[PDB]
């Protein structure tokens, strides 16, 4: 019922996916055999620096809750919850830039080394400040008003 992923123990909480194979193409035109997870669920991201909540729908990011201890902890936590989503967006985010062995870890293992494109790609919202929330910028940099599309900063 437990599984790891980027160095972050996930939980799911909540809902239920199905498989399904899919041929999807990287920002560098590379043919990657992803298995798509259909359905929305729910998961808990637990790591030695940061934890969060993650609701996730097919290839959707739904929203994800994170609390951190450092910047660096809430941008790992950041990066695992997005290659975990399998966007489209995050896919494309792969630019310059072949990858070399999953394909899952293939990307977590690119956007580790750097979540330019990635952040930069995301797509930024207005936060409602309902949640008491805090939004974070594609640099990282905390915001009252504006926050990555989904991702919410708790304490
Ligand atoms: C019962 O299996 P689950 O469906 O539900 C817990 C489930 C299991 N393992 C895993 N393990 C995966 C994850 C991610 C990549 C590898 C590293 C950890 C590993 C793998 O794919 O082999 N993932 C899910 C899973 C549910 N939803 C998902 N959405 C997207 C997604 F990339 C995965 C998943």
């Known amino acids: 019922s437990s599984f790891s992923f980027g160095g972050f123990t996930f939980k799911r909480t909540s809902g239920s996916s199905i498989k399904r194979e899919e041929e999807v193409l990287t920002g560098n035109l590379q043919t990657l055999k992803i298995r798509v997870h259909e359905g929305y669920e729910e998961f808990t991201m637990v790591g030695k620096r940061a934890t969060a909540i993650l609701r996730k729908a097919t290839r959707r990011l739904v929203q994800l809750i994170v609390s ?22 995050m896919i494309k985010a792969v630019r310059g830039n072949f990858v070399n062995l ?54």
């Open 102 to 155: 999953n394909p899952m870890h293939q990307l977590l293992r690119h956007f580790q080394k750097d979540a330019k494109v990635l952040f930069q790609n995301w797509g930024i919202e207005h936060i409602d400040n309902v949640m008491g929330m805090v939004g974070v910028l594609p640099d990282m940099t905390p915001s009252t008003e504006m926050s990555m599309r989904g991702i919410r900063v708790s304490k």
């Open 68 to 89: 951190g201890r450092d910047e660096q902890s809430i941008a790992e936590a950041i990066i695992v919850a997005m290659v975990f989503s399998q966007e489209d967006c």
